[PDB]
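Observation: inputs received (chain + DO9).
Thought: call the complex predictor directly.
Action: predict_structure
Action Input:
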Amino acid sequence: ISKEYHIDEEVGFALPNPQENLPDFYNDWMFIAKHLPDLIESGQLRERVEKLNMLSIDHLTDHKSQRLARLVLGCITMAYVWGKGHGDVRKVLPRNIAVPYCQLSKKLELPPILVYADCVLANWKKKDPNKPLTYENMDVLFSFRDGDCSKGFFLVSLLVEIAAASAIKVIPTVFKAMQMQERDTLLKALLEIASCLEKALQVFHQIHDHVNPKAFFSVLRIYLSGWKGNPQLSDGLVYEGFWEDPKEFAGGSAGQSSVFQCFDVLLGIQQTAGGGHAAQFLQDMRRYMPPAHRNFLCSLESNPSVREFVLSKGDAGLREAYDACVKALVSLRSYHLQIVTKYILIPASQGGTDLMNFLKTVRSTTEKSLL
Ligand code: HEM
Ligand SMILES: N#Cc1ccc(NC(=S)NCc2cnc3scc(C#CC4CC4)n23)cc1
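Observation:
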């Protein structure tokens, strides 16, 4: 019962059935994007980017073409800026790609950098459209290097977003039940949300079968990095012919995901409060979500607190149903921390401490919401 927040009841915040091809006015863009592994390895990518003609965004008509093109030029920008991923950076992004990229990003109210809604939510397809949404029947649209495990990283994350869609559709009835004062309906709605969050934990387990720790840490993580607070581009990136000053934009982060923020909001977990670093980062990352999903989070915050409603009723059954979702959220973030230890902390030993303190802070705040 959500209206124009661009939430799908099957795939949630993910883009349903993303477009795979752009108009023929843009083959020059997509030939580069489709061959990023070979163009980067051979050292040809940067020159092809500098060889491109400046195209107009006026031939991108519908919303899906605008999102796919945003994914196409976002991966090209990452490839051009980071190159072969070994430290030799580009600090200027050529005008014939920088101007249409920023023009399209202002059109979609997104920053001109690859974000979570680009390479996870809009970077997928079904192998055969009549078989279900499972890893074996899905594939990504774009990757950076052969063996970067971008498919495993993006698809498993996407599958977690799909598993969360089952709990998102319950949100309108949680709020309807509190307003209409229906305790029994509220209890069932909370237990249904807890069940869906418990089952999303099992989807997290698939990351061990499709992502390699060395490939993720030494390759994939490099291409998703940004230029805010980064010593490699200490002043940001120069977007040619759009700004004359260098601009800083944060690297891709799953803090840009709306799924875990929307359940923090729904359950009254004030992840955005307290003035700490973690609360600061999660609020800023809302600028990197699609505006419709930004608006969905805002309206969720406007509704009455589910936590304070449950606390004020002296109802043990309602409290335990609320605690089941909070526990399910804690379990997701605890298992996720174990993944970070395996895929970042240990590879980095063979920087990583500030990341785990952020995730520990976010999990600790979730845990202290227990009633
Ligand atoms: C190899 C696998 C993974 C690694 C190494 C990893 C690592 C990280 C790191 C370093 C952060 C903090 C910096 C940032 O936000 O980008 C983070 C945040 C986050 N990641 Fe992942 N992650 C992995 C898989 C996943 C998956 C499959 C999901 C499913 C949605 C996910 C969801 C999140 C969320 C929601 C956050 C925000 C923090 C929070 O809400 O608690 N991660 N992850
Ligand atoms: N050293 C070090 C180190 C420092 C920071 C990071 N942060 C990363 S890769 N954040 C993205 C992320 C985190 N979790 C998940 S699930 C799906 C995605 C995605 C995506 C595309 C980028 C938008 N993500 C990793 C390593």
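Thought: report the result.
Final Answer: Residues 153, 156-157, 160, 204, 207, 211, 216, 253-255, 257, 260, 333, 336, 339-340, 343-344, 355, 358-359, 362 surround protoporphyrin IX containing FE (ligand 1) (CB under 6 Å). The chain is about 55% helix and 5% strand.
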